[PDB]
Structures are given as C-alpha cells and as structure tokens.
A paper describes a structure:
Echoviruses belong to enterovirus species B (EV-B) of the Enterovirus genus within the Picornaviridae family, which are single-stranded, positive RNA viruses (~30 nm) without a lipid envelope (nonenveloped virus). Protomers consist of the capsid protein (VP1, VP2, and VP3) and the smaller internal protein VP4.
Detailed characterizations of mature E18 particles, the E18/FcRn complex under physiological conditions (pH 7.4), and the E18/FcRn complex under acidic conditions (pH 5.5) were performed. The density map of all three particles showed clear protein backbones and side chains of most residues, which allowed us to build the atomic model. The E18 mature particle has a pseudo-T=3 symmetry arrangement resembling other picornavirus architectures. The mature E18 particles alone did not exhibit significant changes under acidic conditions.
Residue numbers in the entry:
A (entry chain C): 1 to 238
B (entry chain C), C (entry chain C): 1 to 60
D (entry chain D), E (entry chain D), F (entry chain D): 27 to 68
G (entry chain B): 11 to 260
H (entry chain A), I (entry chain A), J (entry chain A): 5 to 76, 81 to 277
Write the structure that this text describes.
Amino acid sequence: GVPVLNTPGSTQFLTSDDFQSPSAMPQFDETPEMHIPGEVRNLMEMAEVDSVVPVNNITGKTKSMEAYQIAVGTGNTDKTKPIFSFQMDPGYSSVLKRTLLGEMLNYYAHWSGSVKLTFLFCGSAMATGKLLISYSPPGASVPSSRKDAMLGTHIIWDIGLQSSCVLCVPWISQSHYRMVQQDPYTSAGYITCWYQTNIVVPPGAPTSCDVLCFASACNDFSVRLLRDTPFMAQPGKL
Amino acid sequence: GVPVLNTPGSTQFLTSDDFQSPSAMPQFDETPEMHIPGEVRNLMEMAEVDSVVPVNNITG
Amino acid sequence: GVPVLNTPGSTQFLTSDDFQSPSAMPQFDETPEMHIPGEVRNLMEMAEVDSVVPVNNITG
Amino acid sequence: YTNINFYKDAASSASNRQELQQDPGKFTDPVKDLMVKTLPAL
Amino acid sequence: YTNINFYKDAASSASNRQELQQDPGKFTDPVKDLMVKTLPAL
Amino acid sequence: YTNINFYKDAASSASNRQELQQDPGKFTDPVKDLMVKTLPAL
Amino acid sequence: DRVRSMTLGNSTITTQESANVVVGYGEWPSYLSDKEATAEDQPTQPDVATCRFYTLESVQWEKSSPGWWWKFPEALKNMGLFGQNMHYHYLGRAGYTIHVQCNASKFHQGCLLVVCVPEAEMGCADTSTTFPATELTTEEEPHVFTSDSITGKKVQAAVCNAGMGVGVGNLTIFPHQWINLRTNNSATIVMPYINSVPMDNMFRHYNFTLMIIPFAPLNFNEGATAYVPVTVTIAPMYAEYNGLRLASTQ
Amino acid sequence: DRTVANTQPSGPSNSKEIPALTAVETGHTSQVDPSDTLQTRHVVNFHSRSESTVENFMGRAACVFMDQYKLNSTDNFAVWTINVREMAQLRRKCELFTYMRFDIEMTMVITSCQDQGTQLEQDMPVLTHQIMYVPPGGPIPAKVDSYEWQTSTNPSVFWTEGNAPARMSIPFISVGNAYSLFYDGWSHFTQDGTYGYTTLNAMGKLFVRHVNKSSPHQITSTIRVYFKPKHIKAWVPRPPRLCPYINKGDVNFVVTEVTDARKSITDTP
Amino acid sequence: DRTVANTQPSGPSNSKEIPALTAVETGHTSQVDPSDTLQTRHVVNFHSRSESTVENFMGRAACVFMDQYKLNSTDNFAVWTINVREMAQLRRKCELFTYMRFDIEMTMVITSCQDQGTQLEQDMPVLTHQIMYVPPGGPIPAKVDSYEWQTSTNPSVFWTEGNAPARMSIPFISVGNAYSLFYDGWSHFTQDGTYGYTTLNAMGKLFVRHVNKSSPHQITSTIRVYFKPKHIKAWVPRPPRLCPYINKGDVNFVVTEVTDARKSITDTP
Amino acid sequence: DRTVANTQPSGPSNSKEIPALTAVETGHTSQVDPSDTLQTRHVVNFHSRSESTVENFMGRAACVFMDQYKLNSTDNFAVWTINVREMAQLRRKCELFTYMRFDIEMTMVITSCQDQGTQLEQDMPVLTHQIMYVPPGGPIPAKVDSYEWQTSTNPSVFWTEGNAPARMSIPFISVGNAYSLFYDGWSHFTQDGTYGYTTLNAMGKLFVRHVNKSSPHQITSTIRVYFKPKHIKAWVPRPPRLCPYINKGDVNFVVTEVTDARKSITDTP
Ligand SMILES: CCCCCCCCCCCCCCCC(=O)O
Ligand SMILES: CCCCCCCCCCCCCCCC(=O)O
Ligand SMILES: CCCCCCCCCCCCCCCC(=O)O
C-alpha cells in the first residue's frame, strides 16, 4: 500500500507525448532487415537538392512547360528594363512557394539559413553574353534601374563553357529566425536581373534563347517550429 | 504521497497481456509432479509427423 | 501490480504547487541566450532605489 | 523490471513466454534400432 | 526525491524556488567614480 | 528514469527522439568521379 | 574528362563529349549475399550472354514533342537471352546502366531531362475506372506525353503532372542528368536494384520508369538538319535467376 | 545533437579559382558557401536540426478512421479495413517515401450521445465497448450476438466510459522487409486484376460493438482512431503530391496548376 | 530463442547413397532435407519458432460462461458448474492433449441494462456485484438473502460498476497429477454409472448476485468470464476434432466428411 | 539562503567624518546604516529575503482567458488569440519588466451546466472536450465538423469530465532572445501601420469544442485557463502602472492622481 497522490494533467491524451504502452502482440518475431539503398534520415537533405523554379508564373503558363522558361532576346529595344523580379521570401512568394524547399518549409513556422540560386543557359553554343544578378536587402523600394541594383550583393555572369553561375544570399537578418508566413516585422529582399551586355549571335543562329533557374538551401539552414501544410484540403469523404 | 500521472491505456482489458494478479488461494500446496511420457513443447513437432492425405476427394 | 493506496488531497488543483508535467512540444530547440544589461533577481533591489515622495498631498 | 515479483505466491506470476525448447525425436523417430538416412532402411 | 527527473525535456521540470542571489549595486551605485560614505561626496 | 523499460517487448518502448545523424552526400553528390569546387567542373 | 569508354560483354560504347556518370544513390550493383537470401536453391548466373548492351528503337525529337516514357524491365523482353531466361524463371534480380544519345550541331539549341523514377504509378484519365495494361507498356515503341488534358481509359499524360500527380519540376530528387546540346550529347545513369523484397517476378512488376521531357524546346533556322534522332541503350548487370519451370507464353 | 557549420572569415581575392562556375548537366548540386563569393565575418552557429528528423516529423498522432454505431440490424457494429489512405492529412505525409518500417501506437476515443426523440425519459448505467482485431483469413462476425465475439485467440480491448482513452502498440507485421506505399504492378501474373497498392495491403479488419444488450431509447456512439509511428526508417524520398486526392483506392488525379498566377514577370507585390 | 537450421551447399553426385529411398512400415518419419536431393546454395535462416510454443498458443483469454441475472424468485442469481466444455472455441484447443497442468487467470466483465417498460422514470445509484466460489461439498445458497452469502471461509470478490474488470489467479487444484480431459472408464467398479470425463470433473460451483436490495423498476445484468492458462505443460498430443460438437457432457458426434469434394483426381482450380 | 546583515555596536563620536551628508545630484543612493548616525547594540538577524525573488513572485497561477461554448452555428466552438494583456491581475505584475524569459505551465478548468428551459427531461452520458493549439500560419477551423480538427501535427488534449484538470508545459517559443512586453516602434519601415506591442506578438490561436455530436436539450460549458511562469529571468525593471487599463491592444490611459488627498501638510490621522 504505497501512498500516492495524483497530479493535475492525469487521464488525458496529448498527441505529442512519449509513454510506454502494453503490446497487443507478445513475443512477435519480425522479418530480418535488408539493406535498401537511399535511406533518408533528416528532412533537410531533401531541401538541399536543387529543383526547378516556375519564374514565369504569368497567366496562361501555370498549366504548361513555359512557366520554367525565362526568355532572353537580342535587340536594341527595352535594354534598360528588368529581365525578371520576385520576392526573396521563400515561404509565401508564388515563384518559389511550391518548390522542394518551399514544400518542406510549409510544414514549419520558423526558418533560418542561406539559399543559393543557379542559372542554366539553354542556348546555341555560338551565343555569348553577360548578365547581372543582384539581391537587394530589405529596407528600401524595389530597384528600378541597374544603377540601383549594382549597390547590393551582385555577381556578373559570363556565359560560356561552364554554362552555370551560382548566387548566394548571405542571411542578412536582424533576428536569428524568420517566420514562414508573411509578417511586416521579418521580411526578405528582392531578386532582380539586368543586362550587362547584349547577347550576340552569328548569322544563321536562333535569335532567342531560354534560361532556367534552380533553388536550394545551404548547409546552415534550419527549421524549429512545427505546423501543418496549408496546401492540402479535404472537402468530403474519399 | 508519491506524485503519479496516469497514462492513456489504463483501466482496460487486453486478451494478450502478461500482468501479475493477486492469488485467490494463498499458500496452497500442489500435488507433487510425476513423469508422464510424451511431453509436447512446441506445436511444430506435431506438424513434422507424417499423415495420410485424401488425394481422391472426388464425389462419393 | 504494485499495490498503492490513494491519500486525501488527490485530484486537486492548487495554485502554489511545484509538480512535473508532460511537455507539449518535445525536443524543441530554444534560441541561444544573450547578455541583456540590467538583470533584476530580487524585488528588494527596486525597493532600495530612492523615489520622490508626494508630501504636499493637499487638495488641488 | 520484468524479473521482480510483488506477490509471494508462485501462481501470482507472469507467463513464461520466452522459453524455446524442442524434442521432435520422441515422435519422428520412435524406432528402437538406429536408422541411417544414407544407408538402406532394410 | 526532489532531485529526480522523470521526463527527458528540460521544460518539464519543477520551478527553481530555492535560489537566492542579489546584486543591488547595479542600480544603487551606477556612478563611474567610487564614492566613500565617510568622505565628502564632492 | 528515461532509460528504464517496464515491458519485455521491444515495440513497447518510447520513440527515439534524441538521434541526429545525416548523410546528404547520397543525393547532392551522386557522381562517380570527384568534383572540386575550386577546380573547373569540366 | 569529356571522353569515356564503357565495355560490357561483347559490346562497347564510346563517347567524346559527356559528363561524369551518376551512380544511383552512391551504391554500385552487386550480387545477393547469403545472409540476405531467402530462397533455397542454386541460382543460375549467366555473365556474358545476359549482361550486355541492348539498343532500343529510336525516336525523333520534333519541336512540339512533349516527351516519352519507357517501363522496364518488360521492355527488355524478347531481346537476346535476357528475355528467354525471364520466360523460364519465376524470380530474378538485375541491375541496369542506361545510356541516352542525342547529337546536334553548334547552331541548335534545346535541353532534355533524363530521370529514372522507381515504382512510378500512373493514374487514369477517368478517375472512376481503370485502363488496360496495354496503355502502360507496349514493349516496342515509346509512349508519348501530351500538352493538354485528355479523356478516356488512358493515363493522364499531361506534362504538367507527368501522370504521377506531382510537379514536373520536382522530379530532380531522383537520380537524373541533363542533355544540353551546347555542352553534351550523351547521358549515362547507373542504377542499382531497389525493391522491398529481395527478388520479385519481372513480368508483373515494373521496377522503374525512364522519362525524357524537353524543358527547352528545340529551335533551329532554315538549312539545318531537321531530323534529330534520340536513341536509348540499356545493359543489364549482375543478372541472377531462381526458380525453373515451363516457359510462360506472354 | 550537433549544431550546424560555422561561418569562416573571408577577404578580397583575385585568382583563377572559380567556385561559382559549375555545370548542372552532371547531376550534382553545387556546394558553394556564402564565404566563397563574399567577404564575411566569423560567427558561431548553435542552431540544431533536431525537429527535422523523420522520427520527430512522424511522431504525432493523426486521425485515421471515424464511424458510428447505434444501440437500440447491421447498424449495431462497425467494420473497418485497416488502411492509411482514408485521411488526406496523414496520407500526404506518408507518401513522401517509397518504403518505410514503423511501429504504430494506436489509441481510440469513444463518445456517446442520446438521439433526439419525442420521449427521452430514461435512466441508464455506464456503457462498455469492445474492439476486436480479426487477423487476415479469420472469421468475420455477421451479428452483434454472433459466436466470433468470444476472442479465444484474437486480441480485444474493453473500455468503460469515463476512464482514460485506451492505447495499444503493434509491431512490424508486414510479410516483406518494408511497407510498400507505391506498387507499380498487377495482382495476376498475366498482367490483369487490380493495378495499384491494394494488392500488397493485406491488413486485417476491425470490429467495434456495444457490450450492453439494449436500452429503452436509442443511443448512438462514435469512435475515432489515432496512429503514431515510432522506431521509423524511411527510404527513397518522393516529391510531394500536388493535386488533391479523389479516391482512396487509386492515385487518380485531375490536371492542376504548378503555382499561383502573377501579373507579370517583373511584378513585385 | 534459437533460429531454424541453415541450408548447406550441394553439388552433383552419383553414388550408392539412397537418402530418398526409405520404408514407411517401420513407423519412422523420414529426415530427408532439400539439400539431399537437389543442388542448393547456402542461406542463413533467422526464423524462430517462438509463437508455436504451447505456452504462447494457450496464452490468450477465451470466453467460458455467459448468463443473466435480474434485479427487481430464482432469477436473481446465477449458478455455474466450472467446466471448460461449454464453448467450442476453447474446447477444440484444449482437446489436442490428453493430460495438461496449468494455472488459470480468470477475469469477469459485468454489464447492466434497463428493461423496456411502459414506465421508465427512475434514479438509481451505482451498482455492486458479488461473486462467490463454493468449494466442492460446501453448502449452496437457495435464496438471494440466504445465510451462505457471508463468506467466512469461501473466497469472494466485490466489484463496483465503472471500474476496471476484476481479475484473480487460481493454482493447480486437481486431486491427481494432471487434468484428464479424456477418461475412458465408468464411475462405478461394476462397469456402470456415467461413462465419460464427467466423473473426474469435481470442480465447485460459482454464484453471482446483486448486492443492492431492490430497484423501482427491473434491471438485468450479464456476466462473462474469460480464462487464460499460464505455466502450462502438455502430454500425449491428439488429433483435432473433425465433427462439430453436439452435447457438452459427452463426445457424441455425427458422421462427417474428411475433406471437401473436388471435380476429379486431376482437377486443378 | 543567506540572512540579512547584522547590526554592529556603536558609541559616541565627534570627528570630521560625515556619513549623513551626501549629494543626490550624482544619481547614487546613499548607503547609510542606522549604526552610522545612532548608538546601537549588537543583534543577529536571521531574516531571509526568500519570497521576494522573481521566481517565487511569479510562481503562482493566474486566470488569462474565459469563454463559453454550447452544445445543442459559430457558438459551438471558441477562438482565442494567446495574449497576456486581457486580465488586469497578471498584466500589472508582468509590466514591471521590459524583457522576460519564462516557461509557462498551462492548466484548464472546464464546467458544464444545463440551460433553463420549459422541458428539461434528459439523460446524457459523460462529456468530452478537445483543445487544439494551431501554430501561427496554420489553417483555422470554420465549423465543428471541419477537417482541421484531426490533429495530424498540431497538439491536442482530450479531457473527460470528472477527472483532474489537464496540465501542459510549453518552452520558450519566441523568435527573439526574450519577450518584449513594451515595443516603441511601428510595424512598417515607413513609420506606419500599428504602433504598440501587437506587432511582436505572433502567438498562435486556441480552439475548444465538444466531442459529443448532439444533445436532446441545449448544454453550455465554460473553460478557464491559468498560467504559471517558471524558470524565469527578468531585465530592466519598470515603475508600476498607476492608471487603470482601458483597452487590451494599447496602453492608452486617463489622467489620474498620484496619491490620496489629505487635509493639510501637518495633518496626522
Ligand atoms: C483493438 C486491439 C487489437 C488491435 C490490434 C492492432 C491493430 C492492427 C493494425 C495493424 C497494422 C498497423 C500498421 C499498418 C499500416 C499500413 O497498412 O501501412
Ligand atoms: C470469484 C472469486 C473466487 C474464484 C475462485 C476461482 C475459480 C475456481 C475455478 C477453479 C478451477 C480452474 C481450472 C479448472 C479447469 C478444468 O476444470 O479443467
Ligand atoms: C492544448 C494543448 C496544446 C497547448 C499548446 C501550448 C499553448 C501555446 C501558448 C504558447 C505561448 C505561451 C507564452 C506566451 C506568453 C506571451 O505571449 O508573452
């Protein structure tokens, strides 16, 4: 007859608890294990893998293959205007919301780390050109000229044999963590591209080419708070 | 007054559980054991024994 | 089946008690601490600080 | 745990569910004379 | 008892109600130069 | 506590929530030949 | 590093512009061990006869081509002694190396994605019924995707979802390589055996699916060659078979 | 529980090293760090990827089944085939891997409510419920008072209302070496039958009933089951499902959109 | 918990050894292994015969008795002679051995329900039940308020409704060295009386009743008893019973069929 | 647990030491002791400042929320944004410091009562309640039978009435290094939006509902939540709030009086 006193919180079911429970099947023998290649252990490994980003999310292209194609041209017209522009925020920006990084980010409410974006030039081997890609830290309006975009984190890409260049955002934030949802207190910056030089092609070559972008997380990325994804809904019984 | 917290799954009866229970008859003395030939211990021993198979299971 | 006997005072909520309780969020990682100047530890430190006294509390 | 008895009586104990002992020779081979598989039976 | 934790998490622990540490010098004496009670202040 | 098992069965145990092991090289770097970041890829 | 040479059996493949080969998940294919074995018999292990390159039919990459898919290992039947052993054997194990060839001049542009999806499951266009097995596998010609929603007792071949109900751009998680006409003209992927059971019947189970989807459309000017062929070559490796009986006519 | 990598100081550099330039046709993901392309200071990172693990991600209960049985023909008991493809919330999470091994920790919640009628005057004692798991191939009851209810060998749980919810643990009970969520094959060897993962799913059925024989007026009850996977191992990560689910049996879907439409290519909200 | 035997490699052989040939008139079962007649590889078997043991096979509760008693003459209490030949589910399992020693772990489930009447307005407190085991030769109660109910020496259990089911353990209480399930003899020495196993069964009776004296309206209760054998030993295995049971007292049966009829000798479905 | 300082003996003194004289413009508080200006004896003080600590001061439960939900549209469930600025009793205590780190130990008390109606004859079983904490950004239920209630990832607690009150523990879940009770800033970078501490408060919502589907007659329930901070650290002490609170969102106030009026300067009651 050991004297015991019950404490508040007894006889309750909490989803996030670890308690021992009696086994329904006693002394069951399981099948021997086998080595299956490709064992994932953490969910950040999937985030690190590169995925294509639907930059051209304009109307009429969200249900086709043209959403991933960033068109480039060779001309004298509109050489002072941005090629593309979007928000750096991975959580809610439509451009990169549904990517592999975004999908895993929508199961969490906090995030931190750095993100890297690479660009592939899908054009003729004889074509050559240069491009300027810049990241503007938050605190000012979106840049409207290349003079405004050359005062931030920028890299000059020379198209050639390598055919790919990587841009890294170096985690400039006031706090240690940011919020996946849109909140004015914590927000990222903007990504913009500009023409360093025009694209020159020899006679007999296609005039227009395409560029594709890939986004992935760095080795210092982490997520702390756990929530449910907002991309799934069940109206009725299946 | 040791503080304890009840866990889900209490006050239930599961057929396949092993728990100690109070004895109805305390200090009962059983009859001494005796050696009875033919002690089965596993149910696969009976399976190993050969048995006739009704192959001709046709009607009648 | 350890025999236990409940004692009076069980299944009650007292405001001034210290008991362990299950955690809603398991294995959560908190933000690293930072040194913030001006850490109060006892409430008598605030009492020791001098304050102005409204002696002339007359009407108006 | 799993080896502590809180009751004096022996019947007030858990079942022995981790014992594995076999002896199929009682039924499969009841012959008095030894028979070799390689050698002919008769 | 009173020093045994039955839960792995650190937040699932009792409050620290037996700690007594004080430092009134932060607020009572914030002056850069030392002041002696016996000696005149100025 | 936290390391005592009151049940013989292995499935009747708490979840392993304090294990941290990673291997991103399986997916990030599946190439047969080693690639150096400083050196050109091709 | 561009040049590479692969020799298996009595066949050899030579390439002058290519990238480093990709091993699936970092594990080279091998033979089953005794501890992981479950069968009780002596496996037959042909080496030269059933492990060599087999060149499939080629296809033309037109400007409006949406893509193609193949469902191995059934596509490898009736070719050589690999298919013949399949008919007479209930169980089998094998590994594969996939080489895809597509060449163009310096005045042509375009990009291709080559990816192997393990245990890819295809849904029907009509959600309330199922499709015949002919739609998934034909064993002679590649099945083509489409750029619009289709109807009937057929798979949803829309390139947007790829027939699996997932984003087309997220397929890079699986082992893959890219074929950019400006840089390379050949892609090689080595895949190990991946299955829940150590061995399984080849005919009724489709281990993996090879999908080629053009992200960048092919474009060229007048006077250039308009017929660009795409050829796929696969070679089984470490073939093992257990269980011998009468041949299965299928 | 180790932390993430720290940042190393960098300075101006002019040389032939090209960390930024790479080739994406090889199939390799670049390992460039922010220090490689910018001038950075030295910071010590104590952040840990402790909640991103598969075990912690899957370690939370989710609803899998819901049904109603009444006490006053076939409405007095409920029958459920044990499958994890009936609730979208848990189906999406478990379809990110091809093969998985795990041990479930099932729990149930049972509630009862009197039905609205003209006459409601009644006094009833406490209620008791029985849950029986029939192994595959076992006899299935056809009536509330059928002979299968006496569980000589099958497991059973009896839970009187008012107490804590019942909980049980089940080990790995798959014939193969793992649970195959996606199966690309046909049941028959002639490439016929049922195409999908239904062939490999051979889990048994579950039966719930009221122990009390009768009540003066009708009473209805609802049972909800929650599953928590533990001791979990995963293989072959898969992309998330974009399109909403249509039917539990198959993976049929409708054409959807990759991302939300924007006004223009250079439109920043 | 050892595993089963592994397979050893074999090769082609031509010699005078004849493992396959044997004689079945000797009464010995052949010990031929698959390696002896075929060419086999080497495999390591980790399968264990852990659930085929008698203790694990018998280690599961089964229903043995069911009856109803009412609260408002002889209907207020129930009388049961303790026998294991009343439920077919457990009778078939325990008739595979001639002699057995075991210790039971009995448990009971008690439910109550109000009876359907014209007037049902009543308010009643919780109910309590008493179960008494009368040793062989002891006085048997004849009324609910009889004097035998005060258990000076007999065991008793009181269980208020709403709590966990009661459980008790009983040791080996047989006069002989084991429980004789099958007895081929007559009670009297003149080869007369009752033929069967009823003579050796001398177990006592069980009595259940309501502790509460009366209720404004009739209430009925049902008790179910489950037995789990533990610390079990078995002797003389017996073939399973083919024909369905007819009467609890004896082993009388009707002529049945060995196997299901097939179309022909060479008919494969 | 040390004691306070003891008193030291003093005697008559005539010298140039001036402990009493000081300057208050320096910003330093004088450290004069009673022995310095008077003749005192020697006493040993054993008094300890053990209950003046911040941890003990904050270590007591306080009510933070109260609402009603009914069982019979949007009245069947309650929604609460987790904030500590709704009850004056705890708001005043927690506004004495600018920044604070603490771990709460929440508990709930749930009571139910039948509503007064013309017809009150009903018999109902025990009631069960569910409490779900939606993380920030998570979907919010819009109906009692909505799909968000199946907590695949969100935490939940089920408490049957009649048992002990439920209790849970929550760790430090702030993005920053501490909880900023007072924030002197604007949400937007253009000095617009909402001014106050509401911008930094990003805590999630709480949902409570009835598990039982329906009742013959309406029943209403009330839930009260209590918070106890533990493992607490405080910074930047602040003066107590004089004026009574007006609105939870902001710190708006009305002009009040410093002290109670007296008759005259030399008036002693
Ligand atoms: C009610 C008491 C007995 C309950 C027995 C346990 C319930 C049986 C469920 C076993 C299968 C669990 C895992 C299957 C998941 C899957 O099919 O992928
Ligand atoms: C109700 C409390 C007292 C109960 C006493 C225990 C019940 C008596 C049963 C004893 C016999 C058990 C084993 C007999 C089986 C058999 O007859 O073969
Ligand atoms: C009902 C079970 C789940 C309950 C989850 C815990 C409740 C969430 C509250 C977290 C915030 C606590 C501290 C916030 C105080 C503040 O805002 O200053």
